[model samples]
Target chain A: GANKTVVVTTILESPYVMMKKNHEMLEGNERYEGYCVDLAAEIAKHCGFKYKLTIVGDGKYGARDADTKIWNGMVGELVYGKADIAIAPLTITYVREEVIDFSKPFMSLGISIMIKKGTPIESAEDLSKQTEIAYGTLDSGSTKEFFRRSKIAVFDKMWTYMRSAEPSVFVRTTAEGVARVRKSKGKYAYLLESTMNEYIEQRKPCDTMKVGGNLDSKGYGIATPKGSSLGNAVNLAVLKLSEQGLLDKLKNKWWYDKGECGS
Target chain B: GANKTVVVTTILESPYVMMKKNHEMLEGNERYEGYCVDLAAEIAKHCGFKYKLTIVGDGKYGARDADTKIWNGMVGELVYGKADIAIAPLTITYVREEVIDFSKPFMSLGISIMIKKGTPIESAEDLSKQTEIAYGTLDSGSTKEFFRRSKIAVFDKMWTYMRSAEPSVFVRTTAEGVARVRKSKGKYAYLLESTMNEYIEQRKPCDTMKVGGNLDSKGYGIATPKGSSLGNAVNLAVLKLSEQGLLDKLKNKWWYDKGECGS
Candidate 1:
C-alpha cells in the first residue's frame, strides 16, 4: 500500500547537491554527484518510496510565512502536499518546526568564512581588524541569519562590522561569495560553511578555505509535513546510515574529493 | 533476484545512530533515531533497496585497520560484501575511495574547535599565539589528519602550535575531547567540528561554543563495494534530497543534534 511517487524539491548548492552539466542525456538518478544526492538514494531505498527531484520553485526552501503560518521551499513542498516527504538541508528553526514535522537532524552546521589561501584573514576578527579586504555573505540563508540574530560577545562585535561595512558587501549565495573572492581580488571574502569552503579548496587553484570558525549551531533535518506517515521510518533510516558510517563517507566525497562533479 | 537481505554495519556515534535505550523492543528501522537514520530511510526509498540495520559486528564503523589494507567500519561492510551500501558520516579520503566506491557526498564538513565560550580563543591565530590554555583535537579521524597534512599558512601555524604545546594535550578520540571539555574548568579546549561543537552548545550549562572557525571544508558520502551498480542510484538519491534542501538539513542533524550524549 505504498503511494510512492513524490516531487522532491531542492536548491543548487554545490558539493552537497547540484544539477548535472549533462543531466538530460543521463537517465534516472545518474544526473548528479554530491553528498546530498547520495543520501537521497539511500533514504528512498530504505523508506520504500519513489521520487523525482525538482529544484525548489522559489529557491527559499520553506521559510515561515509568518502571516499565513505556512512554510515554503522544500518545507512548502510538503505543506502544500506537492510532495509526500522532504529530505533536504532544511533548518529546524523554531518557526519551520512549528508547521512541518522534521526528522531528527542528519547534520549540523553554522555560518563560516571563505577566503583566499593566503589572504591574511583567518577569522572574523581578522576581517574586522583589517581594512584592505572587504567581506560579505549570502543575503538570506542561515549564514546571514546567524549574523543578524547573534547576541553573543564576538558575534555582537561581528554584527556591527558586517552591518555598517563601507562597501555593503552582500551576495545571494556562497557561489557569489566565492566569486567575490576571485574577481574582487584579495579584498573580498565570503562567509559560508566549512563544508563548502573545504570542497572548493580541493578544486583547481585551491584558493579558498573556511576561516575563523562557525558562528552558531543548528540541526539540519529531514522535513515532512506535520503528519507524513513516513516521518518515523525515514528518521530511522537516517539513524541506520549514521550507524553504518555512510554519513561520514558522504561527508568526504563532496568535501574532499578532487574529481569533477560527475560520476 | 535482488539484494533484499542487505547487511548494514554501523558505528555507535552518539545520538546520531545509537540503539534506543530500549532497543530490541523496536520492530524494524523504528529501533533508532537521530540524523543518519532518517537519511537512510529516504535513501532506501529512492534507491529501491531492502536492508536490515545491524550495528557493525566489530563495533567500529570506519577505522584504519593496520593488519589488512582495508577499511573496517561500514566501508569494510561494503568491501567485504557483508552489506550492499552505507549511508553514514564516513570521511571520504583518497585511501578509502580507492578501495570502495563512494557515492557523491551527502553532507559537507570540516574539523574545528569546540571550546568553552570564554576560553579567550578568538581565532586559530589567537589560540596558536597564546601559551596559556593548551588545546588539541581527536587523534584518529580527519580532524586529526587535517593538522597532520595541512600546508596552508594559518593551518601550518596551527600545526606548530598543536605540535609543541607545553601541556601537549591530544586525545585519542572525539569522545575524549568532549570529556576534556566537560571536565575542563575553562582551561582545556576540544578541537573537533563545527557540527559537534554546535551540538554540544545546546546541552545543559551550554559551556562550549564553537570558536574561531572550521579549519577546512569537506563532506560525507554513501559507500558501496568499490564498484557496485548501486553507486549511480545512490548519487541520484543524494541530489534528489539536496535539491529538496533535505541534504543540508540532514547534514546538521547528526553532526550537531545533542540528545542523549549531552546527558
Candidate 2:
C-alpha cells in the first residue's frame, strides 16, 4: 500500500493551483505550479508517499444533488474511491465532513467582499441598503451557500436580493466573478473567500480591492475518505508544516513575492 | 455518564473568561462572564449537557516538562482525566493534538505585536533589527514555542534574542505582558495572540495598538481527551455555531458591544 502512488485530487485555482506557462513542454506533476503544488510536494515527502496530482474532472468543489442525492466534484472522487487524497483549497464544511475526513485547517479564510477600487461601499450593510451597485457570489460554493442559509437580518436581506436579482448575479467560477468586477467599473462587487481576494488584489492591473470585515470565518483543509489510514499522517504533516511556518512561507511566496502590484 | 456534570477546565484570560464584579456573591458558573463563558453555555444548550466551569489551578496554558515529561495546566487536566473538556482561549497546537482531541476551531488568531501608542517599531523585522525595543511572548505557550522551534531566518533570530535577553523579557501572564508594555512607554513590546491584543486595544486606557501583519496563523479549539465520545458531538456543535454565524455574533457581543473604549 505504501508503494502505491497516491491519487491527489485538486482544483485549478489561482495562487493555489495553476498550470505552468510552459505547460506544453512539461510532464506529470511538473506541469503544475502554485501554492498547493508546493504544499502537496512537502506533504507527500513528510508522509513518506509517492503521489500523482489529478484535477477533479467535474470542476466543482463538491455539493450534493437534491434530486439524485449523489455527491460530485473532488469530494465525490474520494467517496467513489477515485482519489486517494485531496490536497486543495476545499473547505471543511459540516456536510462534507460527514462523508470525508479533513485535516486540521492548513489555512484560515472568510467570505469577503471584492469591489473595483473606489467603490462607494465600505461594508456589507452598505451594499444591502443600496441598489445601484450590484453584488453576487460564485455559484455552487460556500459563499453562495452562506448567503442562502443565513437568517441574520442583514445577510437575509442581501440574500433575498441576490437570489432574485436581474441578469443573474451568480458567476460560474471565481475568475468570471472577478472579471465581472473588473469590467463593471465599480458597479459590481464580488463575494469570494478572503484568501483568493487578497491574492487577486496583488496581481497586475490591481484595480480590485477587498473591503469590509469578513462575512464569516472558515478554513481550507486537506480531505481524505473517512477513516483512511493515510488521514492521521497527512493531518500530522499539516500541523508540522504550520508550526514550522512553511504554510506561511508558501502563502507569501505565491501571494506576495511574485505579486505584480507594488506595495 | 451523560448524567454527570461536565467539568470544564479553562484559564482566566481577559475578555475570554474573567470573574464577574460580584463574583464572590455568585455561585459556580454564574461567577464567570466573557466570550468563552457565553460560548460554553451555547455549546451545552446545543449539545444537551450540564457543565461546570473551573479555572485551571496551575494557570499555565500548557507545556510538557523537559525532565518529568508531565503536561501542565488545562491540557494536563484533560490528559490526567481531571477534566471532561477545556473551553478557554486555548490554542490548538500539534503537541496538544497528539494527546487530546480538539473540535474544529471556534476562533481564529495569530501571533501579533502589541505596542504602546506611537511605538517606533512597526513589524517583526523592525523589532528584530533594532535593539532599543525589547520583545517577548508569554512563557511556555505556543507563541514562545513558535519562536523556539522556528527555522525561518527572521523568527530564528528573534528567538535567539528572546531566549537569552538580559533580565528576561518573558512574562508569566498575558496581563503582565500588557502591563509591561503600557508602563515601558514604547521600550517593551509584547508578542501575543491577536485575539487578546485586539481585545486590549478596545479596553479602557486604550494606550496600546496591534502592529503589522500577524507573524503566524492558528486557531483556538475546545479540547477533549483522545477518543472521547463527546468529541464527535461537540465538534459538530462548533461547526453548526460557526455556520450559523453564532460564533461571529458571540465574538461581537463580548469584544465590541461590551468594549469600554469608543469606536
Candidate 3:
C-alpha cells in the first residue's frame, strides 16, 4: 500500500525546483514554483497520493564515497529510508542503478563546458594541452568522478593535468564554479550538466554560454529505493505521462515559455 | 513487401559519410567509408534488407528556401520521393518534421562556436558587440535560418551585425568557414553543429577548437517520407542498436577511433 503522503526529496536548481521570492508569505507547495514542482503535483495526483516537497539537507545529487563506503545526497536519503523518492535532476548511472531503481529517463542530458564570451578555450582537448587556462568540475558529482575515474585518453590526460595543477581548480558547487568562470575573465572554464548550462545561458546578463559537444551522454531519472512498491506505480505513471505528451508540454513551460533570454 | 534494395540519400560531411581515400580502387558501396556507411550496413542487417547509399547531389542538409518554394539537400531527395530514407546528419526541425517522419534521434547536437587556438572571440554576443572580429555561418542550413528568423534581442542584434558587415562575412561551405577562422588568425569565428566541430578539432594540426555550448538543442534522426512502410523497421533497428550499446560503440569507432589527434 502507498503512504497517504510521500516524502519526496529534490534540489534547488533553477527552472527545476526554486524558491519563491515571496516564499515567506505562502505555505506548503504554494511556497515553490518550477518544472519539478508542477511535475510533483501531476505525479502525486495520478498516483493517488499527496507529497511533501523537501530539500535535501546537504543539497547534493548523491554519490558513494570510496574510502568510507558510504552514500551521500539524494541517493543517500532514499537508501536510508529518509525519503520515498527523489524527484529532482538526479542522474541515472550504472553505479546508482545498482542501489536505486530509476524510472525510464524523464530527461536526457550530457556533460558540457561553460565559458565566458571571449575565452580562448574550446574543447576539453584544448584545455588539456595548455597551462594558460584553468578548468574544474563540481567537486562531488558524476561530472567530477567522470574525470577522476576516466579511462579515455583525452579525459585521462585531462585528469592528469587537473590533479597536478596549482591553486587547486575544483569548486564546491555548480554556482561557485560558474561564478569563478564569470569573474575570472578569460582564465577559467567550468564543466557541468547540459540542462543547468542551458538554463543559465537563458538567464539575465547572458554573458556565459555552453560550448563544445557533450563529453558523454546520460539521462535524469525519477529515482526510488530498490524494492519500493511505489517504484512500479511511479514508473508506469512516468511512461504514461511521456506517451501522452505531458512531459514535452512541461519542458516548454519551464524552458522556453518562461525563458528570459529570448531563446 | 520490402524492395530488394532501399535508396538512401546522405550528405558528404566528413566522418559521417565520406569518399574513401582508395576510392579509385573501390566501386558502389565499397567506394564510401565512414559512420553512416557502417550504420547503413547495421540497419540493413537488422531489418533484413539491402540498400544503396547515394550522396545528396547538392551537398547540403535539407532546408526550405525563402524565395524559391523548393527544399534542398537530402530533405529534397526525401520529399520528392527520389530517395527512400535519409541516413546522414540530418537535423530534426519543425519544418522537416511536418514533411517527414524521424526515428528516435540517433544523435544529439547543437550549434557551437569554432575558433582558432588563440581567438579573442568567445561567445556569439562577444562577436556581436565588436567589429575587430568577423563571423558567419554556411550560406545555407538551419544555422543560418536560426539567426535570420530569431526574435530574441541578442540574436536579433547579432543578425543585424552579420547582415551589414562589410567584405561579405558569409561562406558557402563549413570547410570554407573553418578555413577562414584558421587563416584569419583571431579575427573570425565559425558557427556550426558541435559534431562536425568536435570531429574537426581532432583532425591534424589540431589548431581549431569548438569553443562554446550549443546555441540550441536538437538531434539527428534517420528520416523517411511521411508514413513510409520501412519507418517502423528502421526505428526498431535504431532502438535495438542503442539499447545493446552498439550505437555508442559505433560512435567511438568513427569519431574517436579514427581521430587524428591524440584524443
Candidate 4:
C-alpha cells in the first residue's frame, strides 16, 4: 500500500533542478523543469507511486552543523520524516549514507578543477604547491568539505595550504567562484563537481574549461530515509532506466542538446 | 605463408622490459623477464606466430630529433621495418599515431608527480607557482618532450616556467630524477608516468609516494609501424588479452606480487 503521495525533496541548482520561467502559472511538480523533474516522473511511473515535488526548505544539498549536530536542507527533511525521499543532485557521502540510504548511483561524477581560458593550472596538485594563482571550492559544498575532513595525505596537505593562504581562497557560492575565475584574469580557479563544470563549459561566453581529470570519484543517488521499503524499488528502477539508456538520453536532453557552446 | 620468426623491438625500461639476472644461462627471448617479455609471448601465441625479442638499440621509447627529423629508439626500428611490432611501455601520442599504428591502450597512465613521503608538494600547479622546490622529468622521455613541444595553454605555461628555471631543472634519466627527489628531502619532485611511479611506491623502504591525480591523461599502446601486416592480428590479440583478464592479472603479477609495500 503506497502513500497517496510521496514527498520528494529537491533543490534549485542549475541544469539539475531549476525553476521554470512560467512557474507561477504551473502547479505542483509542473513548476520545475530540469533533469530531476523528468527523472522524478520516470521513477514514479516505474514504482507505481504518486509524488509531490517540493523544493528544499533550506537551499543546500545537505550538511550537518558541527556545533548543533543538526542536519540541514533536504537531508534534514528526510531525517525528520518531513520528506519521503530526496531526488536532487544530492551527493552520497559517508555522513549522509549513515543516516539515509542511497539508491544505486543515478549518475557518476567527480570533483573537477575549473580554470579560466588562459590559466596555467591543469591539476589540483598545481594549485596546492603554488602561490602565484589562488584557487578554492564553494565554501559549503562537498568539495570544500572533502578537503576539510579528508585524511588522504594529498587533500590534507592541500587543506593546510588553502587554510593558511592569505586573503582566504574560499568563496560563498559557486557563482561567485566562477565570476572570480573570469575576472581574476587567469589568477583564480574553482573546484566543483564535473556535472556542473561540464554544463558551464557549454554555456555562453565559454572561456572556462574543466582542466585535467577529476580529483576523486563519487556519485549522486536517489536517497531514502534509513531502511525505507521504497529503497529497493527505487534502486531497481534506476538500474532499469540506466540499462534501457533512458538516463543517458535524459542527460543528453538536458546537458548537451541545448548547449549554447555547440558541444 | 607466414614468416617463421618475427622481430619485436622493445626498450629495457624497468618493470616493463628488463634483462634477466641469469641471462648468461639463457638464450634469445629467454634472456629477458618482465611485463613486456610475458606480453610478447602471449601475443605471439595468440597470433599464431614465432617471434624474436630484441631490445631497442637506441634505448628510448621513441622521440623525434629536432634537427635530424629522424626517429630514434624502437620507433625508428619499426619505421625502418627492422621489427614487426614494438611492444614496450610505449606511449601512444599524436606524433606517433600519425606515423605508426597503436593498439587499443593496453595500460592507461598519465603524468604523475613523484615526491618524497613528507614533501609539501601535491600537484603540478604547486610546483609551477613556487620556486622553493624544483621539479623535472627524464630529459629525453615523452613527458619532457610534451612540455617542450606543447602549445596547449596550461602545458605551454608550465613549459615557460620550467624552461627558464635557473640551474637546469631537467634530469638526464628517470633514475637521476628519482635520486634527486630522494636526496633533496622536501625540495624536489619528479614528474613521470604513473605506472613507474606506482612501481617505485611499492619498492623497498617506500620513502616515495605518487601524490594527487595525473597532470594529463594518456595510455601505453602496443605499437606497429604504419601499414604493418601484423597490425590487425596484434590489435585483436590485445583485445582478447584484455577481455580474458590477462592484462590485469599480468599487471598484478609484475607490480603487486613482488610489492614490498602492503597494497
Report, for every candidate in turn, its global Cα lDDT versus the true structure: 0.68, 0.92, 0.81, 0.80
Q: What is the lDDT of residue B225 in candidate 4?
A: 78
Q: Summarize candidate 2's per-residue lDDT along B110-185 as a digit string, tens digits.
A: 9999999999888999999989999999977889988988888888999999999988999999999999999997
Ranking by lDDT: 2, 3, 4, 1
**By lDDT, is 2 or 3 better?**
2
lDDT per residue, candidate 4, B67-153, as tens digits?
A: 998888788889878888998988766567667877656776778999999888777777777878888777656798778865556
Give TM-scores for every candidate, taking all chains together and pairing residue i with residue i.
0.50, 0.94, 0.58, 0.52
Which order, best to worst by DockQ?
Answer: 2, 3, 1, 4
lDDT of 3 by residue, A1-263 (tens): 24677999998877899889989988877888898898888888889887899898998888899899689999999999999999988876656767887765667788899998788877888888887889888766778777887777788888888777788888777788888989998798888999889888887777798888988776677999998989767866765565445776788778873556565
Best by the lDDT measure = 2
Off by over 4 Å in 4: A1-263, B151-154, B165-167
RMSD of 1: 15.8
Better of 1 and 4 by TM-score: 4
Steric clashes per prediction: 117, 0, 8, 7
* Residue B51 miss distance in model 4 (angstroms): 1.1
Predicted complexes: DockQ each:
0.03, 0.72, 0.03, 0.02
Candidate 3 at B148: error in angstroms? 1.6
RMSD of each: 15.8, 2.1, 11.2, 18.4
